[PDB]
Design a protein around this nucleic acid. Sequence first.
DNA 1: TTGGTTTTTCGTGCCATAGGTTAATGACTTTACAGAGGTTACGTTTACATACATTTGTGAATGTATGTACCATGAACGTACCATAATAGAAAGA
Length: 63
Amino acid sequence: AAAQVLSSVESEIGRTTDPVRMYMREMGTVELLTREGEIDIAKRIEDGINQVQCSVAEYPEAI
DNA sequence: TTGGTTTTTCGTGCCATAGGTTAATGACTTTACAGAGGTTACGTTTACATACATTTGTGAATGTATGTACCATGAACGTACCATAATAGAAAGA
């Protein structure tokens, strides 16, 4: 959703081999998250860890 | 009157009687080689006490080992002198 700006950037770039500008042009796609926006990410982490632990608990020979 | 055959002495040559230095094998005798017999001072073999090493446990040096819970949201963070010409490349008008 941000490659249209990166194409116009790379049209100006004369094959820069320095990884610093390359790194801080690939990392600039995702913007800043909000303060309470990562709470839902943490809850999805909770749901994933709980699903893995339920999959372990349904295995009978783990005990 | 002169040359040459004949003849006799005489010192010289040949033969025989005497008598002495010195070769012979030996018998020497002296030196050298061959025979055993008592004595010396080592050279190899053996046992025994003590020593440096080398083999063990035990008290200290470091070293990775995982974490610390007000708030920390994009940049190079100071690099650098700018020579010269063979050979290609990506486009721009011929």
